[PDB]
Every structure is written in C-alpha cells, then in structure tokens.
C-alpha cells in the first residue's frame, strides 16, 4: 500500500544526450507521500540527480525524514551501477535533496561505459522514510 515505509522505483530518461531542462518522474508513494526522481544537466558537464518529496502540496506544516540510495543503473553490469546515499529531513523549504554533480556527464553518456543505451539512462531510488509529521493528524 501507499503507506509502505520504503520502496524502490525507477525512471528512464530518454533522449538523454539532449537533456536541457530539469525532468521529473511520476510519483512513487511512500508513507502516503509522493516521491519523485529529478534529473537535470549541471555545470553537459555533470548529471544532477535529486530525490524530491511532496513538492506540489501547498502545505507548510509537513516534514518527513528519510534515507535513500540514488543510483544510476549500468545496464551491462549492475555491479557497475553507480550510487550515492542521502539522509535528509524533507519539508516545504527543502523538498528535494541530492547531488548536482552526481556523475560526470561525459562518463554517463559514454557508450562504452554501459550506462546509456539508445540515448536512454535509467535512474533508481531506494527510499526508506520515517512516519511524516504535519500531514495526517
């Protein structure tokens, strides 16, 4: 159910080499809140990769602490997938957390590296969130 305390979801960004704007995945519900993968180019140069939580809500009373593993899938060999962990208290003023320089753009888009195929790159997030505050009273 959406009240689950954790989950793993993926989002495949197409026409990756041409990415120019920030892109958002559909939501994955955890602790009944919508979580999304956010990817954006940073300085070509580097891949920006962030985890976003409950960003569309106009509430300013909510908060949810969570730890997560942000990973860029290596389709040729999963042991080569690259990941970084985060731990953050998400709330309206800090609704996303991650790395602007998650990986070098040149490396992720390198066809010989195994992360890109048909100009597509798959992002994955394993999020373990605590019970939120200021949502369901």
């Amino acid at each position: 159910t959406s009240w689950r305390s954790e989950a793993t979801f993926q989002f495949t960004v197409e026409r990756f080499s041409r990415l120019s704007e920030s892109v958002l995945s559909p939501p994955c519900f955890v602790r009944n809140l919508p979580w999304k993968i956010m990817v954006m180019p940073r300085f070509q140069k580097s891949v920006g990769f962030f985890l976003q939580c409950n960003a569309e809500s106009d509430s300013t009373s909510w908060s949810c602490h969570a730890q997560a593993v942000l990973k860029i899938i290596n389709y040729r060999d999963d042991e080569k997938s690259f990941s970084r962990r985060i731990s953050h208290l998400f709330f309206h003023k800090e609704n996303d957390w991650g790395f602007s320089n998650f990986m070098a753009w040149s490396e992720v888009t390198d066809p010989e590296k195994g992360f890109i195929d048909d100009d597509k790159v798959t992002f994955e997030v394993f999020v373990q969130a605590d019970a939120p505050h200021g949502v369901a009273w």
Partner: peptide, 7 residues
C-alpha cells in the same frame, strides 16, 4: 556520497 544538497 559527497555533500548532498538541494537542487
């Protein structure tokens, strides 16, 4: 994992 932050 090297200094996580907001977008």
């Amino acid at each position: 994992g090297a200094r996580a932050h907001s977008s």
